Design a protein around this ligand. Structure first.
Ligand SMILES: [Mg+2]
Ligand SMILES: [Mg+2]
Length: 85
DNA sequence: CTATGTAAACAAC
DNA sequence: GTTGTTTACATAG
């Protein structure tokens, strides 16, 4: 294992999360939820705040890679939708 | 040198 | 306390 959760890179995990959504878009909190619900290593980490290393790494990847695109979200108290490409 | 993971400064909310 | 962008640095290859 390249990482504690497997060989997937964070970009690959985020990509799988987005692709699993029916409308192919998820908010940042939803990407974290997908990790906690689906990746064994993260199953006992839902109780963490945003300073958690892995959450910071997710945010870093979303901004760094052009493959992740940010779209405005109409829902009043919710953040941006993240999509692929 | 590049890809990747990790940490943190910093803005804006 | 979160969301988002960014620099900085470490290491594997
Ligand atoms: Mg991006
Ligand atoms: Mg060393």
């Amino acid at each position: 294992r390249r990482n504690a959760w497997g060989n997937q890179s964070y970009a690959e995990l985020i990509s799988q999360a987005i692709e699993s959504a029916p409308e192919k878009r998820l908010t940042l909190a939803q990407i974290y939820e997908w990790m906690v619900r689906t990746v064994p290593y993260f199953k006992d980490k839902g109780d963490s705040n945003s300073s958690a290393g892995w959450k910071n790494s997710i945010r870093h990847n979303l901004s760094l890679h052009s493959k992740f695109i940010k779209v405005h979200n109409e829902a009043t108290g919710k953040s941006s939708w993240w999509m692929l490409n």
